[PDB]
Amino acid sequence: FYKREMFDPAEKYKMDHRRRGIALIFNHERFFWHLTLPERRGTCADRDNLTRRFSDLGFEVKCFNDLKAEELLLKIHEVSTVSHADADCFVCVFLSHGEGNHIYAYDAKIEIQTLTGLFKGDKCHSLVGKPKIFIIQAARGNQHDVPVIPTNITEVDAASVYTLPAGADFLMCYSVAEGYYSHRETVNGSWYIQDLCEMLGKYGSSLEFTELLTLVNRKVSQRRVDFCKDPSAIGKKQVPCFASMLTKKLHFFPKS
Amino acid sequence: MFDPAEKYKMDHRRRGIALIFNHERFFWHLTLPERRGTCADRDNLTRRFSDLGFEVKCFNDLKAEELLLKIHEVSTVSHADADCFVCVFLSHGEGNHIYAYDAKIEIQTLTGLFKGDKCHSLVGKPKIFIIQAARGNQTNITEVDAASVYTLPAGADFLMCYSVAEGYYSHRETVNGSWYIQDLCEMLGKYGSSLEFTELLTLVNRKVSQRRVDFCKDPSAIGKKQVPCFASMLTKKLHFFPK
Ligand SMILES: O=c1[nH]c(N2CCCC2)cc2ccccc12
């Protein structure tokens, strides 16, 4: 007995490589004054939470704090051009503000398509047919701060980043969809990342990953702020979403 | 308590309504090409959704006002006895817009009609939009159109399903129908009644993206790959087990 090359309704990505793969985390807390963007207190909690969860799944995690755009591009270009032949998959997380198709680095914005395009096709042959998962916590920075050089609070940011797709075997995960609001607690971190990390810890090692993202959708969409603490946060619901171009089931069973 | 495997309750008296808006021809002033093969798509979809328990309603070449009127009428009736709601658009599109016969309509206007405040009886139920719409180029022939419609998200418990993502190309056979719709219907027929629906959509991703573009009867279409996508805001597992 063997498996003939017949359409399998339950096909899974092969997750038996020597290594799980790299998980990149781009963490942005502060921005060049000329961008007139507010700080993102709580993002370091998000970064740490993610590092622990992804590391327990076998990923090699690399974090970068407050990179300038050129440095960021350089770093991601460097990761895209090495061999991922011995890896199962690739994860890239952006924790920043954003606008439309753009994510903000420290000093400038970068087009998302530019970042994902580095891992397409034969630009990165050794990731072809492997899951390429981008996780994006980025929304509109509230701008009631000046264009001049300069306790757990929940900050509420309007969705601003387009929920773009990205190519075969890409999975694009967004903290929030158009019309909704992203929330970040200044000590505990983002609603989305907290709930993502909690599900990863509890179910990451067995649950099909888009099914886990669906759990995150439910958890986040059911959260309520105070109403005593911020009353105008009243009514600003958060609905995450994910755009999948995956072609197989994705699991993170513990590597043998 | 929290259930990691919770499913939408698909227990209601009826499965629900599946609306199909089918556009084959457009008013001359729009200068859009005909969509031969779309009638096969309409028929294929009707059979699949009907076998899944859906009350299917098809409308061919409605003008924008008629289309808006019809979908508003559907959004304002009670879906209290229904499991869910499906809406399919077969047309050309651009950005945020899908073409009716005479004019374009914003997708957000269409999905907004079924958001919780506007449609109480669908709150907490899957609302599934399937969109075969790309850029109209201005015996079985394969037509190849550039992706043009933004892969928009919609609200909680919406699932937005797109024939093609930015950078890729949608294909339609004049006799057999669209690649995306053909593969979707094929999967619906074999696995619709058992497989979790986003897992089924993943199969469709695989099926469409593996269709070779190496040797086209039209050398111009060589290398113009199709990759679909879906944007999920579902909050539970979705199955269409026989009612
Ligand atoms: O490219 C996109 N543009 C836009 N917009 C440009 C016009 C305003 C929205 C929205 C979107 C959403 C999901 C996926 C892609 C897109």
From Swiss-Prot, chain A:
Protein name, per record: Caspase-6
Domain of life, per lineage: Eukaryota
Functional description taken from the UniProt entry: Cysteine protease that plays essential roles in programmed cell death, axonal degeneration, development and innate immunity. Acts as a non-canonical executioner caspase during apoptosis: localizes in the nucleus and cleaves the nuclear structural protein NUMA1 and lamin A/LMNA thereby inducing nuclear shrinkage and fragmentation. Lamin-A/LMNA cleavage is required for chromatin condensation and nuclear disassembly during apoptotic execution. (Microbial infection) Proteolytically cleaves the N protein of coronaviruses such as MERS-CoV and SARS-CoV. The cleavage of MERS-CoV N-protein leads to two fragments and modulates coronavirus replication by regulating IFN signaling. The two fragments produced by the cleavage interact with IRF3 inhibiting its nuclear translocation after activation and reduce the expression of IFNB and IFN-stimulated genes. The same mechanism seems to be used by other coronaviruses such as SARS-CoV and SARS-CoV-2 to enhance their replication.
Signal peptide positions (record): none
One Gene Ontology cellular component: nucleus
Region (Tri-arginine exosite): 18-20
Gene this chain is encoded by: CASP6
One Pfam family named in its UniProt record: Peptidase_C14
S-palmitoyl cysteine lipid attachment residues: 228, 241
Residues bearing the modification Phosphoserine: 55, 221
Entries under SMART domains matching the protein: CASc
Family (UniProt): Belongs to the peptidase C14A family.
